[PDB]
Design a protein around this nucleic acid. Structure first.
Lengths: 189, 183, 200, 107
RNA sequence: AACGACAAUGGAAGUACCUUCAUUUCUUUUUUUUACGGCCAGACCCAACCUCGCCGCGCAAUUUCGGUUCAACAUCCUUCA
RNA sequence: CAUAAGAAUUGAGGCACCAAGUGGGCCUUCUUCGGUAAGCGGAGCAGGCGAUGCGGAAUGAACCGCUUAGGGAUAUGUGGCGUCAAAACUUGUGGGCUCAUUCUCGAUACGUGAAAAGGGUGUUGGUGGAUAGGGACAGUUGGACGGUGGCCAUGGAAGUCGGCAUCCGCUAAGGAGUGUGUAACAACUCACCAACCGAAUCCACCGGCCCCGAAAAUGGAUGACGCUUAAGCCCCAUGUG
RNA sequence: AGCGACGUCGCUUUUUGAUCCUUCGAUGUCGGCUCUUCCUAACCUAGCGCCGCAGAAGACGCUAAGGGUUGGAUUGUUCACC
RNA sequence: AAGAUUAUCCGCGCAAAGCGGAGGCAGUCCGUUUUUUUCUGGGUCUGCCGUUCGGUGGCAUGUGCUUGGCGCUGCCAUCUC
RNA sequence: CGAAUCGCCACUUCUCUUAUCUGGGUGCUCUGCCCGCCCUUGUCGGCGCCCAGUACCUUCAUUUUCACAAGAU
């Protein structure tokens, strides 16, 4: 056996984080967002109590070394939601057949596809919030936003997968409801 | 909270070699699982190289050069007095005692046991507060039961007439007590 | 030792089995609980395939008589232990007849003691503390295994009362702490009292 | 070797073994499962088969062929009066299934 | 007053039960168990199988850059060399 | 019988009488023939088996060990010491690799599906080149312009369906042009470099362990369990220090 | 795409051969009817990937054996075959 | 099973803490107090006094039902225990 | 008498031919939540905090603690 070791966490600034357990509890502007990690524990060492946290390893295996990054980033992104949130833009896109999506709020209702077939419905999970916006030339547009990209995204990606089609060629297929901007709610501090 | 870092000039515990529990300090880490260790003990620990599996770091870390001499070591680590400091560590008790325990004798033993016996019935239960606290089930209960026997005495079973009869009975126990011992 | 009850929270399955196997063999009625936290290696996939395949067989004419699959977490283990035991030994059988395991934990019985686990059977201790692994209940869930939900409930209760108890002890134990002290260094001196270094 | 054409076998593996079976009083292999929202509700009744005839009632559905028709249909009649409630039972689920916990009486 | 997861009788082994045989027997006799030269084996405790020779060690020395420190310098030596 | 220099043996040798029982073999290291082959056929040597059991190989005529009076006591053999099952659940005193949604990682010699080709950025360790701090490598950033179609086929390509082409300047550099294609121009792009950049990185090889490759009829068998900081595979050790 | 020559290794055994182990003091020859169940190298069905799939239609592949999988005619058949 | 609880009770209450509720009387056999705290008990026999029941009867009523019968409750009273 | 299931425990001792019970939870990331902290703020090093671990009950009332009657029949 060859030493990686295990441990905990890297850091930036204005947002509190757990620093303890498998679980990072990140707290900032937009609240607090927290995740529990499995085998993802790794050479921590606090560099400042409040001001510097890293986890950038001593020895171990190849596979180990990757994770370290993947770990920071994601929790960084825990910070991101907590700070500047996520805002996904989607637009329904269709040409031969018009397509309509509303938002119940608690759930998203999707109409029309190909004359409509089934009604695609997605319940609005927590903090992915959904807006059909339309003025300002907001346009066939859904907006998913909240302070967890992964969720905002997951729900989103899910949506792209909710607008799938089969049988009788991608070379005539396009139409569906596609991701148009995955972002933050804004720039924020 | 993962923390007793090996740091050359760290004091490590010999954990299962025969050479267990002598002491010495890191004079090298020879890599992965091995150490180079040194002491002033006249016979064990010289400069040994020992397996890391077998060692426990003792949370006395000194400064000293990584890879080093006895002579320097002997004195600075003497100066560090960490042996003593380690000596004062509590962990230590039972096992230096263990060696002792092996070699006691009975009487000693009995006393040793007896010490706690002495305390036992004598300084916890005993008294009156903490035995007005938990107390022991019988106490606790006797007290509690006494509230539930405010029930007879005080209360809604019992004792305004029948305990008067109990008074009759009480003497009756004594009437037999007196009689029975009188034969 | 009598009336034995072992706590299987986080214990390496095979090893624990085997270990017990010898124990049973050497003869003693022993008991397991926290059986649901008995452990299986790696992945549920892996655990399933194996079980599935096990479950999958038949005794073709009368499939009702090859192997049965009491899918309790207990039953898994124990049967393993039977497997690790020599079944058809008339002796082992009696041995079996001795052996006790309940899934989960019927409560009242752990309270002044019960601190008991078994050597090698400590799963992290056995498993590399960085290798992946999967949990028994999870398996039994995977093959259904009915009571899991219930079991949960039951567990929560158990903890509570235990906590209740525990708090209570907590109180006494200070008194118990309070056990002298006082005149207690007047242990002897002739013929070498170091009760001071010994237990005091 | 395999036999010359397909079809499927006769009959379904479960009712088997085909017995002159016991306990001929009304085995009920499950029951519905609770909704508190629904008012407590009794969930069955025992009765006696009486016999059959055919009935007339009107058809309709959204777009059936025979919508808008009067229809005549076979029906059963089952003799019925009341059962009288005589006890209350609690089985409790134990991680080993239902075990009766208590029974409550007629007087 | 014999027994049974289910091969069946089978070996071997010991116990239980036995109907059991034959033998020997105590107020100076038998019986199970301790114990015992020299023996007659096996195991423990310490000594040593030598020795020419490096090895090294020490010193100095060159090359030789490393831990300290925020780093450089000290500290050309942490040290390998 | 010395050499001065070069056997060992020799639990007898010599020597003989006469009668049986046998003539289908079969198995093997080794050599080897026939034929694709074949647990096939067919010879050569030695050994077996046969015609023996014991001890080992979960299972086996011939594989391992070993042969046998009857015992006893001891120690070994092969073979083991996770559990089933005797023995370190080998640690004090020990090393790597290897993780395997496979009907499923694998795992006793003999052994006999040793899948084959043939692959795989699985991992694991070379070798050859490198570039590499006067800056390498990624990631960026800016520019990729000008003397000039230097050009020819060519319906239409001025760099650019196509084909022979190609030097200067400016420079950090920028192709007489990397693509994309307005029929062609254009435009779009970067190859070319500076600037950033700040450390390894870059290529080819390498061969290792590991995986894909990888389909038939009854439920299914590394013996069984299981084991994976192994109870795998491989390694050493039972050892001071 | 889809192929796949030339090669050139695989792989299987519902072929066919080879081999004669066993079987001759006995293991009831064809076919077929029936009937079950099983296998998967999935024909149809569930769902994915490709397409030299626009649609259309097919094709290719995966994942899949849970489910399904014919009447005659002629022909002992088998096979064959309408 | 609930505390390492067998003592005049129960109920309630996690649980605290606490709470409530908890018949009598005389006569009778036997005899302790002790899982470290009864505390007169134990123990039956009777007697004697009273919620409940149990039965008796009646009166209403509710309820429910057949070949107007079957079936059951209220209350009352009685009866008894 | 100089070993000899022995006389106990114990048909109300039994998961078994001879300690009670020391009890509950959790992670490796902690020897007390331990903790907390400081500090060239690191791999830390230092300091601090708390009682808490410092596993752990063996029954005369002792045997903190004098001590005493009684084996042999």
């Amino acid at each position: 056996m060859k030493i990686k070791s295990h441990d905990q966490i890297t850091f930036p600034e204005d947002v509190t984080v757990s620093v303890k357990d498998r679980i990072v509890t990140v707290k900032g502007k937009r609240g607090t967002l927290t995740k529990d990690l499995r085998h993802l524990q790794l050479d921590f060492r606090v560099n400042k109590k409040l001001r510097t946290f890293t986890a950038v390893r001593w020895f171990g295996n190849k596979i180990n070394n990757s994770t370290i990054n993947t770990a920071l980033s994601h929790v960084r992104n825990m910070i991101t939601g907590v700070t500047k949130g996520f805002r996904f833009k989607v637009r329904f896109a269709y040409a031969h057949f018009p397509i309509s999506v509303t938002v119940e709020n608690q759930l998203v209702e999707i109409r029309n596809f190909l004359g409509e077939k089934r009604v695609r419905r997605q319940v609005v999970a927590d903090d992915v919030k959904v807006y059909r916006t339309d003025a300002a030339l907001v346009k066939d547009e859904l907006v998913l936003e909240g302070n967890d990209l992964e969720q905002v995204s997951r729900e989103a990606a899910v949506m792209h997968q909710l607008c799938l089609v089969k049988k009788k060629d991608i070379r005539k297929f396009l139409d569906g409801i596609y991701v148009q901007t995955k972002t933050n709610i804004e720039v924020d501090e | 909270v993962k923390a007793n870092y090996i740091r050359a000039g760290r004091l490590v515990r010999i954990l299962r070699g025969p050479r267990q529990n002598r002491v010495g300090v890191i004079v090298d880490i020879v890599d992965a699982n091995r150490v180079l260790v040194e002491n002033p003990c006249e016979q064990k620990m010289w400069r040994h190289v020992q397996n890391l599996k077998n060692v426990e770091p003792l949370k006395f870390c000194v400064s000293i050069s990584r890879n080093c001499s006895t002579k320097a070591l002997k004195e600075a680590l003497e100066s560090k007095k960490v042996l003593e400091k380690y000596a004062a560590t509590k962990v230590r008790r039972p096992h230096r005692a263990k060696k002792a325990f092996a070699e006691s004798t009975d009487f000693e033993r009995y006393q040793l046991r007896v010490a706690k016996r002495s305390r036992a019935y004598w300084a916890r239960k005993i008294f009156d507060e903490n035995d007005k606290k938990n107390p022991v089930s019988w106490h606790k209960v006797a007290l509690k039961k006494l509230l539930k026997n405010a029930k007879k005495v005080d209360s809604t079973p019992a004792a305004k007439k029948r305990v008067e009869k109990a008074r009759a009975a009480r003497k009756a126990r004594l009437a037999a007590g007196k009689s029975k011992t009188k034969v | 030792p009598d009336i034995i009850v072992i706590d299987l929270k986080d214990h390496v399955l095979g090893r624990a089995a085997a270990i017990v196997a010898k124990q049973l063999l050497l003869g003693k009625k022993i008991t397991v609980v926290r059986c649901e936290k008995l452990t299986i290696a790696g992945s549920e996939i892996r655990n399933k395939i194996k079980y599935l395949q096990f479950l999958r067989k038949r005794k073709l004419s009368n499939p009702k008589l090859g192997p049965f699959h009491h899918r309790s977490p207990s039953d898994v283990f124990i049967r393993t232990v039977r497997s690790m035991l020599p079944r058809y030994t008339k002796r082992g059988q009696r041995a079996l007849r001795q052996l006790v395991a309940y899934e989960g934990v019927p409560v009242n019985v752990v309270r002044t003691g019960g601190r008991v686990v078994i050597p090698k059977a400590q799963r992290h201790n056995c498993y590399r503390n960085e290798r992946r692994f999967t949990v028994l209940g999870n398996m039994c869930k995977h093959v259904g295994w009915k009571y899991s939900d219930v079991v949960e409930k039951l567990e929560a209760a158990r903890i509570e009362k235990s906590g209740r108890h525990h708090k209570k002890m907590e109180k006494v134990r200070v008194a118990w702490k309070n056990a002298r002290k006082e005149a207690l260094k007047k242990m002897p001196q002739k013929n070498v009292e170091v009760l001071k270094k010994f237990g005091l | 070797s395999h036999c010359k054409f397909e079809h499927p076998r006769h009959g379904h593996l479960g009712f088997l073994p085909r017995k002159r079976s016991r306990q001929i009083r009304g085995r009920a292999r499950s029951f519905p499962k609770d909704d508190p929202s629904q008012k407590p509700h009794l969930t069955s009744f025992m009765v006696y088969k009486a016999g059959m005839t055919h009935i007339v009632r009107d058809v309709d559905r959204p777009g059936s062929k025979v919508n808008k028709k009067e229809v005549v249909e076979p029906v059963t009649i089952l003799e019925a009066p009341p059962m009288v409630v005589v006890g209350i039972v609690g089985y409790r689920q134990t991680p080993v299934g239902h075990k009766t916990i208590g029974t409550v009486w007629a007087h």
